[PDB]
Design brief:
This is part of a larger assembly, with chains A (51 residues) and B (107 residues). Chain A has 51 residues and is an all-beta fold. Chain A is built from no helices and 2 strands. Chain A is elongated. Helices cover 36% and strands 0% of the residues of chain B. Chain B has helices spanning 39-42, 73-106. Chain B starts with 38 loop residues before the first helix and ends with a helix. Classes of the chains: A mainly beta (51), B mainly alpha (107). The chains hardly touch. Chain A: Belongs to the adenoviridae hexon protein family.
Chain lengths: 51, 107
Amino acid sequence: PTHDVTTERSQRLQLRFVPVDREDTQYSYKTRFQLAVGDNRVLDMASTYFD
Amino acid sequence: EGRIYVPYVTARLPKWSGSVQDKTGSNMLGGVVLPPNSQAHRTETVGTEATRDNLHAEGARRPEDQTPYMILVEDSLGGLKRRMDLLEESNQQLLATLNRLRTGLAA
């Protein structure tokens, strides 16, 4: 197909998010991210992981 | 004895843990956090979350497991062992004595 499949405008394939808050406990580590899904986009969790 | 363990309907478990006793168990780095129960556990305490060594009556992280504490069947088991040891000691003494006597006589 040559239309209605891929976008022509610039757009990353895979984004990278940094912890907006992280707490290093004596026996646990917690971090919160602000996973933002830009408009006209669709994210499939399966493609996400913690580096 | 014909005693069928175990009749009592079972618990279903504690979940939140620390159920077992004198497991002893160890911390982090730590090591030696005392078997659930015992005085050390009752007292709210500070300084044990992130540091090794013993800050309790029992310690060093060298010796464990499942400390034989207070009195159970084990105390009887420990007590029984102690009694046996005492008996053995008594037996040794006797033997020695006998030997000595014999020697003397011969001379």
